[PDB]
Amino acid sequence: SARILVVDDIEANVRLLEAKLTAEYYEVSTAMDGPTALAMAARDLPDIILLDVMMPGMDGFTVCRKLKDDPTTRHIPVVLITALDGRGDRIQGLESGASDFLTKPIDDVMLFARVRSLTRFKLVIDELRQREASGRRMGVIAGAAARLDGLGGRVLIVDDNERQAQRVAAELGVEHRPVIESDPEKAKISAGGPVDLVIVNAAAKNFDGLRFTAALRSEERTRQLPVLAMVDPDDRGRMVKALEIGVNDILSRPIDPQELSARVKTQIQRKRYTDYLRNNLDHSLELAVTDQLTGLHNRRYMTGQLDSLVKRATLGGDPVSALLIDIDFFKKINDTFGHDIGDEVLREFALRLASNVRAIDLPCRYGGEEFVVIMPDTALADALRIAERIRMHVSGSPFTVAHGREMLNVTISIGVSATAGEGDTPEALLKRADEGVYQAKASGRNAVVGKAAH
Amino acid sequence: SARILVVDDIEANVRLLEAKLTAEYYEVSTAMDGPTALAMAARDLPDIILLDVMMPGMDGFTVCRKLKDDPTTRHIPVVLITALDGRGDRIQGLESGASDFLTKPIDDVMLFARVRSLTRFKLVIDELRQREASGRRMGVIAGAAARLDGLGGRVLIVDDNERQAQRVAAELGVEHRPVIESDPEKAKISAGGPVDLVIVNAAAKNFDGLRFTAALRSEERTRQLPVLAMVDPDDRGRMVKALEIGVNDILSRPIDPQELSARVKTQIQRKRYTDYLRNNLDHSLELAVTDQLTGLHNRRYMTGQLDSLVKRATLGGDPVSALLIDIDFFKKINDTFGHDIGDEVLREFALRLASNVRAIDLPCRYGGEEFVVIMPDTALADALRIAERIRMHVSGSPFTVAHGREMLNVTISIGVSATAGEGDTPEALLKRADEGVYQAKASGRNAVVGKAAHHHHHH
């Protein structure tokens, strides 16, 4: 279910861990030092890396720093597993970018809980990386592939221990924008707003922090919001639960502020990376101008042009008209002959429309079975002629279908609309058009109806 | 971690299930009949529905059919939980679209394993649906998924048992294209190729079907490929394991051939649903028409439009004009500052052009450093006005460059052209615009030069 790379200078360690992980059905590979490790990671792109710190030559902190400094590997969670146990070295490991820092001998129940958690989180990151990478024979821009810090960031602190909360707030205060909130019900609201990270106390006295987290996770709006939970280091059952319901990361009471700072930064920086991906995906769709199926222009492109043309109309320029065409009984077509045949009809209809209208006109795909034609410098009466012409052309001739094998009769209903002067707006114009289609429908279909200015 | 709607006519049932699920930290809501259930599902979009079959009025098979027939709710997994246990009841439930069919009194360990599984899957799908609904709302993606299509479908049967393999193949054979493969190592390869679903034997004698599945799941190529596992029915632990390593669904042996058929169809249309989403999302930045770097329309598009406009002009309609713009000393920019900056200038120039010209005009990328603007219903004189305006917008103000650090001065030369008479053609029109450009540049650059058509004294 995951490819895990294990790194340690002692063979006994490597194969003991290996047997545990393959017993849980993971695909394990191994390296015996830093240099090797970095080569395998760059080549094989594993899902997780488990890493010794103390090794002859290049040590685990360095290895870790390099993995995060290459864009190919920056995204892979690293878990340090080591014999060291000083606070000093704990903090050095987290500051160098590791998700967790475990001290030998490790708790297997926590290791597997943690691994199952990381893989769950990597699911969405990886899909989005796949989505982007399918722009690669296209055009990227703007983005200079440049990272994205972990500083800044608005942090909500849900806690009913005033002493503890203020300490947490004082530490984050220098580098971040912290806000305290001891009411869980209010907190639910706040957490929807402008917030990058929530810190929740699982050992709160007046509410259950874990239930509160489950709450955030269940509602679609905040399922993605990172959550860092304060827990008791002696209560293993509760730590596993925390990971299982969906907590991104954990901290031991009493709160070490240097540990706190390191993990808050880690979490804010991963959440930003995944919002870079989401926005890049959405910016590239914005740039699309045609409808994939019919190759006519899409409605986004159309409404942009309609904005400009209607504004110019309102301030005294040329009038604009709109035709809104909707195919009759289109659902009956799909329900009888199948979706494929539905698409043959749509494609043919688009080519017929395009070629019975002037080049200066803007025909477009407006919805599933709806088409709009914008006609610059055209008034209501002419538009009605043009609509009539298209109606008679569509129904005057059957449609080829089932690639060649069969004909079909198709008819359309059309609503027609023209601009009405200074007060008019493109949404008003379109609304009059579909009031026309509605009456045309009601009149018995295969009909044109022009609704007038008010 | 998930919103679960629970439906059943007896309060005792609803209440007992609710306790169990909230003890595992789920958000539960409830209904006690069909009508209510369907209203709640459409208003609230829960992550999973657990459903009784036998209820006064509308029953569970109907409620289920309606949920899958409405696009708002079609994607929600429905699990039926019922006192009924005939194989006929089971097959109807699965045929009406359920992910699973459980008999009361349920196995809780198993219910949770199954819930935990559905939600792991929903994570990918709902990120996808979410992005794709963003695409629909901004006006780019349009259309609809097929409502039927779970038939056809290339199915790989990884199995050790000749005879069982053969029966599975015979049943699927009518509606799908099965292929048998008893070697797991070969099967790893085949599974990469053209395959929609793998059926694997968890109780195979010569290899571990679950290890084989873990294998598919770990390699990035086949991580989404649906897998249906045949399992011994007296091994709850192995069943849970199967669900944990990532199996889409379980089928108890000895194989019921109509159970098989129903569960294969369900998985294949779920696969195609997620494919349809991925295509909408990606394939929509493919098909030329615009120029990647600048956003403006490409050349092929522009010459198509110019043909139609010029023909209409020549037969008596509105006149048409062309501007041909070419950036001055553009080679100097690439050679002094590098192509990163050359591109920054082209992109910005496109922004300044697009926004100083009317919507009805067609600005476009014509060559490396050349742009053309087509102006419908416009004559030579007005075109010269437009060219001059544009020219001063580029030279009147320096260009940002080196992302923010550095300022560059850029100038353009423009040739101008307009339709004239019956005998004119688009290639003639553009050729006059080129002669303009050539004069503009000879005259000392940062200039506009228009070119009228002429005939000889005795033409």
Ligand SMILES: Nc1nc2c(ncn2[C@@H]2O[C@H]3COP(=O)(O)O[C@H]4[C@@H](O)[C@H](n5cnc6c(=O)[nH]c(N)nc65)O[C@@H]4COP(=O)(O)O[C@H]3[C@H]2O)c(=O)[nH]1
């Ligand atoms: N296709 C196209 N044609 C263009 C463009 N610019 C000018 N024309 C054509 O050239 C004419 C005269 O432009 P003008 O001398 O700036 O005289 C202009 C200008 O003084 C003013 N005006 C009109 N629209 C605008 C505008 O959007 N912005 C500004 N700033 N002034 C405008 O009134 C005008 C006279 O209006 P029209 O009757 O339309 O007469 C316009 C129009 O037929 C253009 O970008 N695209």
Ligand SMILES: Nc1nc2c(ncn2[C@@H]2O[C@H]3COP(=O)(O)O[C@H]4[C@@H](O)[C@H](n5cnc6c(=O)[nH]c(N)nc65)O[C@H]4COP(=O)(O)O[C@H]3[C@H]2O)c(=O)[nH]1
């Ligand atoms: N944007 C746009 N506007 C349209 C369209 N169809 C008609 N109109 C507008 O309304 C017109 C009157 O159309 P008509 O009655 O067919 O009267 C037509 C028709 O009889 C003939 N005609 C012009 N172009 C064509 C053509 O391309 N094909 C055919 N078959 N006849 C044409 O002369 C016309 C009168 O010419 P106009 O002065 O242009 O007057 C035109 C035009 O202003 C259209 O598809 N798109």
Ligand SMILES: Nc1nc2c(ncn2[C@@H]2O[C@H]3COP(=O)(O)O[C@H]4[C@@H](O)[C@H](n5cnc6c(=O)[nH]c(N)nc65)O[C@H]4COP(=O)(O)O[C@H]3[C@H]2O)c(=O)[nH]1
């Ligand atoms: N009844 C009518 N139909 C219209 C009108 N405007 C456009 N159409 C329809 O759509 C046209 C294609 O328009 P085009 O792209 O401008 O391409 C147009 C245009 O470029 C030119 N053309 C044809 N007739 C005339 C005309 O009478 N006057 C002018 N100025 N151009 C014409 O060739 C055309 C292609 O020939 P068609 O087969 O007629 O194809 C015509 C016709 O089917 C109109 O006003 N009235």
Ligand SMILES: Nc1nc2c(ncn2[C@@H]2O[C@H]3COP(=O)(O)O[C@H]4[C@@H](O)[C@H](n5cnc6c(=O)[nH]c(N)nc65)O[C@H]4COP(=O)(O)O[C@H]3[C@H]2O)c(=O)[nH]1
């Ligand atoms: N009927 C009418 N509408 C007006 C007038 N002035 C402004 N508008 C409307 O608002 C414009 C945007 O204002 P702009 O800043 O002048 O932005 C203007 C201007 O910078 C330039 N432009 C377009 N036509 C002309 C023109 O005839 N003369 C001049 N000088 N500039 C023009 O590009 C424009 C953007 O073009 P549009 O997309 O058409 O967008 C146009 C148009 O929709 C006007 O006098 N008459």
Ligand SMILES: Nc1nc2c(ncn2[C@@H]2O[C@H](CO[P@@](=O)(S)OP(=O)(O)OP(=O)(O)O)[C@@H](O)[C@H]2O)c(=O)[nH]1
């Ligand atoms: N093949 C195909 N079908 C589509 C597409 N986009 C939307 N549809 C279908 O178009 C159907 C429209 O059915 P309606 O009942 S709303 O429209 P009708 O044409 O049947 O109604 P009228 O007779 O015009 O009143 C919907 O169910 C969609 O599934 C599409 O892109 N390809």
Ligand SMILES: Nc1nc2c(ncn2[C@@H]2O[C@H](CO[P@@](=O)(S)OP(=O)(O)OP(=O)(O)O)[C@@H](O)[C@H]2O)c(=O)[nH]1
């Ligand atoms: N950065 C960048 N440069 C390009 C591109 N497409 C074409 N070019 C280059 O633009 C350069 C222009 O050289 P010219 O001599 S043709 O153009 P000039 O502008 O220097 O000539 P004029 O002074 O106008 O006569 C050529 O070397 C082309 O390789 C491009 O997409 N990005």
Ligand code: BEF
């Ligand atoms: F050698 Be490791 F740091 F335990």
Ligand code: BEF
């Ligand atoms: F009432 Be249910 F079908 F058990």
Ligand SMILES: [Cl-]
């Ligand atoms: Cl001329």
Ligand SMILES: [Mg+2]
């Ligand atoms: Mg060591």
Ligand SMILES: [Mg+2]
């Ligand atoms: Mg319709």
Ligand SMILES: [Mg+2]
């Ligand atoms: Mg009942």
Ligand SMILES: [Mg+2]
């Ligand atoms: Mg040049």
Ligand SMILES: [Mg+2]
């Ligand atoms: Mg050139």
